[PDB]
Amino acid sequence: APTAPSIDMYGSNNLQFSKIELAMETTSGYNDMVKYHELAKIKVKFNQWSGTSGDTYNVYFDGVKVATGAITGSQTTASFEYGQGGLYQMEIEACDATGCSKSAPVEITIADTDGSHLKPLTMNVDPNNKSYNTDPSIVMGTYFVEWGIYGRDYTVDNMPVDNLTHILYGFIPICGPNESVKSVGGNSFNALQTACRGVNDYEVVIHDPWAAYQKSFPQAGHEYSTPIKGNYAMLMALKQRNPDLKIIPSIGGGTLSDPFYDFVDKKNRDTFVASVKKFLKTWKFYDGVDIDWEFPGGGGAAADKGDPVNDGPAYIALMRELRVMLDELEAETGRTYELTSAIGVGYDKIEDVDYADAVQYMDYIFAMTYDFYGGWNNVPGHQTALYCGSFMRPGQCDGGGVDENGEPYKGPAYTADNGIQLLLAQGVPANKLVLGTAMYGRGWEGVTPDTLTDPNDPMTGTATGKLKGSTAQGVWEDGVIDYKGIKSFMLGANNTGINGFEYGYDAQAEAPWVWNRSTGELITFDDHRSVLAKGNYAKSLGLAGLFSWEIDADNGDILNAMHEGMAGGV
Numbered sequence: 001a002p003t004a005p006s007i008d009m010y011g012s013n014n015l016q017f018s019k020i021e022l023a024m025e026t027t028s029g030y031n032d033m034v035k036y037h038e039l040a041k042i043k044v045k046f047n048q049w050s051g052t053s054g055d056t057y058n059v060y061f062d063g064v065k066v067a068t069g070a071i072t073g074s075q076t077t078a079s080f081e082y083g084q085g086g087l088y089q090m091e092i093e094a095c096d097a098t099g100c101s102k103s104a105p106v107e108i109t110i111a112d113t114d115g116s117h118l119k120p121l122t123m124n125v126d127p128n129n130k131s132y133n134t135d136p137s138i139v140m141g142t143y144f145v146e147w148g149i150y151g152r153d154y155t156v157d158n159m160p161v162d163n164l165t166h167i168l169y170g171f172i173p174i175c176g177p178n179e180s181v182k183s184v185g186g187n188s189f190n191a192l193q194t195a196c197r198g199v200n201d202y203e204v205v206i207h208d209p210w211a212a213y214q215k216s217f218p219q220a221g222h223e224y225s226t227p228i229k230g231n232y233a234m235l236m237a238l239k240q241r242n243p244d245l246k247i248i249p250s251i252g253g254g255t256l257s258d259p260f261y262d263f264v265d266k267k268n269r270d271t272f273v274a275s276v277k278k279f280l281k282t283w284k285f286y287d288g289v290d291i292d293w294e295f296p297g298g299g300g301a302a303a304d305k306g307d308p309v310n311d312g313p314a315y316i317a318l319m320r321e322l323r324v325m326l327d328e329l330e331a332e333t334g335r336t337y338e339l340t341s342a343i344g345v346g347y348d349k350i351e352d353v354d355y356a357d358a359v360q361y362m363d364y365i366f367a368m369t370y371d372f373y374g375g376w377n378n379v380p381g382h383q384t385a386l387y388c389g390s391f392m393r394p395g396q397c398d399g400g401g402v403d404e405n406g407e408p409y410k411g412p413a414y415t416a417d418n419g420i421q422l423l424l425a426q427g428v429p430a431n432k433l434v435l436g437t438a439m440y441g442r443g444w445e446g447v448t449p450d451t452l453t454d455p456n457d458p459m460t461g462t463a464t465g466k467l468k469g470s471t472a473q474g475v476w477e478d479g480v481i482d483y484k485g486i487k488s489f490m491l492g493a494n495n496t497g498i499n500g501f502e503y504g505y506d507a508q509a510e511a512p513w514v515w516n517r518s519t520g521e522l523i524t525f526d527d528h529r530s531v532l533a534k535g536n537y538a539k540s541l542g543l544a545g546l547f548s549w550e551i552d553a554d555n556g557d558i559l560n561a562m563h564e565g566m567a568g569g570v
């Protein structure tokens with residue numbers, strides 16, 4: 001006989017609660033911005049404006065009692081805790097000695113990072129991405145980059161998710177020495193310095209919390225009170241649409257690898273491994289961890305770092321220790337967690353790690369079979385060839401010869417096949433290896449006909465510097481261009497060359513190029529024909545499948561060719 005409560009929606013945070021508490025309106029240290037709680041804190045205001053208020057309240061979710069407390073006036077705030085994410089029909093009843101009166105039910109949201117409170121994501125995928133019926137046992141992976149939401153304008157809902165088995169989310173940095181990040185210019189180092197305030201060295205943080213969880217995405221139905229937004233809420237809704245899709249954070253990458261060189265100290269690994277366990281208990285849509293240390297032994301962005309005696313053993317121990325941690329998570333959750341790593345495949349990268357030892361702890365190795373040549377110097381070559389190109393010298397392919405100064409080759413040439421063969425020869429199983437496809441070209445300028453030693457092959461020429469271009473043509477940094485830019489502005493509809501470019505294909509290497517003879521602009525990339533060759537190669541050798549880098553640069557053609565190559569190789 002009290003008055004039935006009316007819920008005050010706006011005074012109760014619009015009934016949007018969360019096990020994860022996330023700063024939405026500042027940028028500060030990761031530990032100050034993100035706190036995961038085992039029980040969500042719930043606070044619901046209700047009113048009984050007329051009649052008697054009664055003396056006690058009970059709160060029900062789907063008919064089950066979850067809280068009780070005192071009513072002592074016409075406005076009551078019910079505060080309590082609840083441990084399970086989801087949408088629930090809440091009722092609140094007011095009671096006195098004569099009986100109880102129950103509010104009408106209203107949906108309350110308890111957000112959790114597995115996306116249990118979210119409907120499947122609505123997709124907005126370019127229809128140039130076709131449908132395929134590729135065997136679900138074959139890996140078809142890609143990287144999605146956190147910053148792709150800015151100028152590139154490529155969001156989670158744009159991914160052709162039914163054509164993917166694995167999304168690697170790039171990149172998760174590690175706090176500590178990060179001089180390489182500084183060298184990149186822009187805001188990347190400053191963002192990282194902020195994220196690490198109040199964080200121990202060697203622990204992981206989110207690099208860009210605005211992209212990751214604050215940015216409101218209209219297409220995902222985000223509104224002001226949504227407790228998780230950004231890429232991560234979209235990935236959580238994506239897991240609701242595609243529960244078998246694996247989404248894996250990639251830690252490191254070319255510019256964020258500097259802290260890994262301290263993992264020769266076990267205390268640093270322990271700190272890192274513990275922080276990765278916590279990260280996966282916080283962000284539960286993630287299904288494992290990908291380690292992208294570029295590179296054990298050195299030769300990466302950090303010119304003064306690299307230990308060829310100790311980095312390999314440290315990498316193996318890291319993999320062993322991550323696998324131990326992941327087994328604890330598998331025990332705690334009943335889920336499967338994957339451990340993978342993207343690795344350099346030049347012979348001088350491979351020779352610094354016993355991968356046959358490391359891979360016993362891993363589900364997959366993503367072989368970085370790209371970036372073999374590029375704008376960092378003036379030597380053209382195929383950046384992502386399967387085999388040795390016509391432009392290589394006698395003995396250069398297997399490393400048994402000498403260069404044009406007469407200096408001995410130090411090892412086999414950089415090609416996908418040489419890398420894969422080196423890894424198989426160490427005893428890495430073929431069905432653990434995933435072969436990489438590039439969705440971008442690298443490029444030079446100044447490779448004009450007068451520099452060529454063979455007049456029909458621009459790979460025999462010499463450049464004056466990196467390719468220059470604008471972001472409108474897909475050039476986001478000097479010397480690199482999106483595959484979709486190459487297609488729009490160099491190849492054209494018929495794949496025969498536009499704007500002064502001609503197309504060529506080195507059949508021995510399995511590698512395409514476009515070349516503008518007058519500017520001497522030359523771009524090495526992967527196309528439909530080279531990606532079919534890679535699929536046939538993967539099939540022949542019984543590799544795990546294919547992956548690509550990076551998905552925002554594709555227009556559908558590369559991922560389609562990955563699927564086509566994996567169906568049809570003889």
Ligand SMILES: C[n+]1cc2c3c(ccc2c2ccc4cc5c(cc4c21)OCO5)OCO3
Pocket residue numbers: 253254255294299300301302303
């Ligand atoms: C050898 N490397 C590899 C890299 C690399 C990256 C990104 C940057 C680099 C890099 C950047 C600056 C450098 C500067 C250097 C150098 C090497 C590098 C260098 O030699 C000494 O002067 O993705 C992984 O592979």
Ligand SMILES: C[n+]1cc2c3c(ccc2c2ccc4cc5c(cc4c21)OCO5)OCO3
Pocket residue numbers: 254371374376
């Ligand atoms: C592979 N390298 C060798 C270099 C180098 C230098 C100076 C710079 C580089 C460099 C710079 C940026 C790079 C960026 C890259 C890369 C490789 C490099 C890279 O591969 C992935 O993206 O003098 C000694 O030899």
